[PDB]
Design a protein around this ligand. Sequence first.
Ligand SMILES: CCC[C@]1(C)C(=O)Nc2ccccc2C(=O)N1CC
Ligand SMILES: CCC[C@]1(C)C(=O)Nc2ccccc2C(=O)N1CC
Lengths: 110, 116, 116, 110
Amino acid sequence: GLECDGKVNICCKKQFFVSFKDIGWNDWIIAPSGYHANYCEGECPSHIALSFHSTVINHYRMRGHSPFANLKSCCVPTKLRPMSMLYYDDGQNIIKKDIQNMIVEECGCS
Amino acid sequence: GLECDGKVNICCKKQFFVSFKDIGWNDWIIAPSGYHANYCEGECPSHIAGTSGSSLSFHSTVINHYRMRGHSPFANLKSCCVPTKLRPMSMLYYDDGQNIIKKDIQNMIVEECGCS
Amino acid sequence: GLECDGKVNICCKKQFFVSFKDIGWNDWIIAPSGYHANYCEGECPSHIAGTSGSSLSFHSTVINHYRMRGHSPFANLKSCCVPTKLRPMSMLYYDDGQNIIKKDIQNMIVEECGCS
Amino acid sequence: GLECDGKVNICCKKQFFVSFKDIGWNDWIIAPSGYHANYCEGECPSHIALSFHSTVINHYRMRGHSPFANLKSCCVPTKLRPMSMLYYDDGQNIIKKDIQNMIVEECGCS
Ligand SMILES: CCC[C@]1(C)C(=O)Nc2ccccc2C(=O)N1CC
Ligand SMILES: CCC[C@]1(C)C(=O)Nc2ccccc2C(=O)N1CC
């Protein structure tokens, strides 16, 4: 997908870093101190809309056949990566775990 | 995730039968000729923004932090009912390399919907 | 090949100004924003079937053998005014690998037309 | 591109061999004795139409904007290969030459 700069208008990935200290989560997250979560922003006009399932919806959208005639496309993550994390749990044990769905790696039009 | 039913107004999964005839792709796809793909639709109000049915991922949890507290752009950003899990499907078709392939094509069937 | 002019009815090359705005592709193409692509049109009667203006390739010469003598399928096969030579063009655009590329894109400008 | 079998209906490459003996050209073509010239046959409907120049024409065709609204697409060679050939010339000298545009290697919709 596209990486947002300040020029591209269409759906892209915006770099976004989050400190656990700044948001007050470091009391239970020991490590890492922060990471690039990222997010998706941007337009999804007709001339673009894994896209495989979305593409077939888009092909149906190309005729006024009416579930998809109205269905607006959205810029959303199309790929997420996990990340290793150390944290306190309910019994306050320190746990090490590969946490799924932590980083947005790519964005796309639904 | 949620499946649509009577009176469900929020993001849910419903049937979508794809016939390749209908979009002309039967000129190169041999099998299957049609399949249940499914689709996601419905409202994503803020009390379910980022969720995947009854689950909330870590990433959605940090976005909610900012959204909840009014920080931009996340305050303006629309939440859309979209697939969160897809399954592949075995397919037999003609490709551009001048031959007929059988292969598992990724992300062809919607398994779960949720709010971006 | 032939260029169109007054009273030319057969296959010839004419102007076609492409503006990327018009087809939405300016959302990822930075430069050029528009260009003279050209196009081929007009009649391909049998006395010029297979030719490229004033030239006739070897391949077209064997097809004409069969066409001329009525052999099928070549007897039924339509002859179309189509490009026979194209030129590339330098382009600056955003690709899917999350970056901005400069590169010579092939077969963007029609140089010569002729009959299939 | 696609290779015609008897099943695909859309624009494909049809294998076609031509003997110079059968067609009476062996008096001036010494070698080779024959070759696969091939040809293109098949439909080109909307859902398909280097395609780069053709694609942009197709993108214009997707609105009734009117040069291309009517312009029917045709199955034609998109790639030709040369082949080495021995032949008698006007002075009846034997010439060896890489003859361009002898084999149709791929077909496509204009
Ligand atoms: C959306 C299915 C995508 C797939 C797998 C493919 O590899 N390329 C394309 C690309 C565009 C349109 C259809 C196909 C297509 O028919 N096939 C074969 C099933
Ligand atoms: C028809 C120009 C083809 C090219 C070179 C490309 O590599 N892929 C696509 C594919 C589909 C549509 C446009 C482009 C596209 O915009 N680009 C960048 C100029």
